[PDB]
Amino acid sequence: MEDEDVPVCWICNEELGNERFRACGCTGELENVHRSCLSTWLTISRNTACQICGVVYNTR
Ligand SMILES: [Zn+2]
Ligand SMILES: [Zn+2]
DSSP states (O other): OTTOSOOEETTTTEEOSOOOOOSOOOSSGGGSOOHHHHHHHHHHHTOSBOTTTOOBOOOO
8 A cells, every 4th residue: 555645746746646647657756747737748848758768648
C-alpha cells in the first residue's frame, strides 16, 4: 500500500491524487499529471509523448 500520498502534476505543480490520464510511465512526478494542463501543454509546446521515457501522452 505504498501508493498512498497524493502525487503532484509536474507541469503546474499541483496535487492531483489520481487524475486518470495515461500520458507516460516514468518513476517520478511525471507518473501523475493533470490531463488538463499536460494535454494542453504538449499541444502548446508541440509534444506527443514524454521525452523522458518515450511514452505517448494519449489524451482524450
Ligand atoms: Zn515519462
Ligand atoms: Zn497540472
